[PDB]
């Protein structure tokens, strides 16, 4: 169902423009998709909710007494 | 110098690592000539029988018949009860039966004791 292309014997083979434009198009849409998804949905890679530092918590909300009462 | 290759039963020695092929004597050359001669005689016989337009059917191979007869019908007349044969036969023919009998009898005994005591939990076990 293709076209006639002869062998080349030690030269670069013949290429149709259609396959070149198709490969370029599909790579282009892949990269466009990656960039678009990164722009609109960035939290999927870098996270969205900050990770709290357990050492930064004060002792008051931690339910701890200064080692004398209980 | 490089590490040596050690041949085994299931990984034999290469031909190119054989010391025998480098110790060449006229007796060995005569032996090799004779082996080629007998091989070529057999090949000539087979090819003469093989290219015959008259021939129909199968070229009977005496070697194949010898192999099948030796493997099948030649065993018992050459059998002799020796310590090796007796011990290997007794082992390989009696040991497995008693091993499996012990295993199954023990398992069924433990299961039966559990059932008699009542603690096995056979709930929903209808089809046996």
């Amino acid at each position: 169902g293709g076209v006639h292309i002869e062998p080349r014997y030690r030269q670069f083979p013949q290429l149709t423009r259609s396959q070149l434009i198709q490969a370029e198009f599909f790579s282009a849409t892949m990269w466009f998709w990656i960039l678009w998804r990164f722009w609109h949905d960035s939290d999927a890679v870098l996270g969205h909710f900050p990770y709290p530092d357990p050492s930064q918590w004060t002792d008051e909300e931690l339910g701890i007494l200064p080692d004398d009462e209980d | 110098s490089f590490p040596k290759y050690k041949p085994s039963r299931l990984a034999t020695l290469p031909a190119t690592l054989d010391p025998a092929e480098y110790d060449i004597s006229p007796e060995t050359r005569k032996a090799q000539a004779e082996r080629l001669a007998i091989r070529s005689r057999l090949k000539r016989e087979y090819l003469l029988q093989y290219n015959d337009p008259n021939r129909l059917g199968v070229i009977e191979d005496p070697a194949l018949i010898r192999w099948t007869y030796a493997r099948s019908a030649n065993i018992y007349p050459n059998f002799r009860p020796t310590p090796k044969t007796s011990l290997l036969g007794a082992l390989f023919g009696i040991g497995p039966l008693f091993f499996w009998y012990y295993v199954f009898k023990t398992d069924r005994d433990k299961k039966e004791k559990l059932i008699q005591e009542g603690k096995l939990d056979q709930t929903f076990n209808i089809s046996y």
Binding site: - | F2, P3, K4, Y5, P14, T16, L17, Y22, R29, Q32, A33, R35, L36, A37, I38, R39, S40, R41, K43, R44, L47, L48, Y50, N51, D52, P53
Partner: protein, 178 residues
């Protein structure tokens, strides 16, 4: 393959065989062409340094350490041509090879198609029928007494003769029948 083997391989043949194997395994190790060319010339130069050696004992002591060195560095996964006894398509077409004699069992309705082919086939059959009777006597008279010493056959020496045992070499199925 085609050629009949000999009783033994000479030292010259063994050295040549080691050379071919070593070059192939270098090519497998050196994937790129220029690197392989460099190391193949190096191997050739290292190979012909003992070219002019005369005594047999040291020459046979060589090719032995050489073979151990080959076996140490032999590339566990060398390159094999696809059709070679190791390649990915070694016997891929052996299920499509059908003997010629099967055509003798064709129904006459089948043989009705391709009438020219079967006419030619019958001519070939007659040719074989005459040639075999000549061939048996030629091989009988030409062979030395006590049996053949090699599995190599003589050609046809007369005018109308054909090479002895030619039917099953000429009528191979094909390399790729279908």
């Amino acid at each position: 393959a085609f050629s009949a083997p000999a009783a033994y391989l000479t030292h010259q043949q063994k050295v040549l065989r080691l050379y071919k194997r070593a070059l192939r395994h270098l090519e497998s190790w050196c994937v790129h062409r220029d690197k392989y060319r460099y190391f193949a010339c190096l191997m050739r130069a290292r190979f012909d340094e003992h070219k002019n050696e005369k005594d047999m004992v040291k020459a046979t002591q060589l090719l032995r350490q050489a073979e151990e060195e080959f076996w140490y560095g032999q590339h566990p996964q060398p390159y094999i041509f696809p059709e070679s006894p190791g390649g990915t398509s070694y016997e891929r077409y052996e299920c499509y090879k059908v003997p010629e004699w099967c055509l003798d069992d064709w129904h006459p309705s089948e043989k009705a198609m391709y009438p020219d082919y079967f006419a030619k086939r019958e001519q070939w059959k007659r040719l074989r029928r005459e040639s075999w009777e000549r061939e048996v006597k030629q091989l009988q008279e030409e062979t030395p007494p006590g049996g053949p010493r090699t599995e190599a056959l003589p050609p046809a020496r007369k005018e109308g003769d054909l090479p002895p045992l030619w039917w099953h070499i000429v009528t191979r199925p094909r390399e790729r029948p279908m």
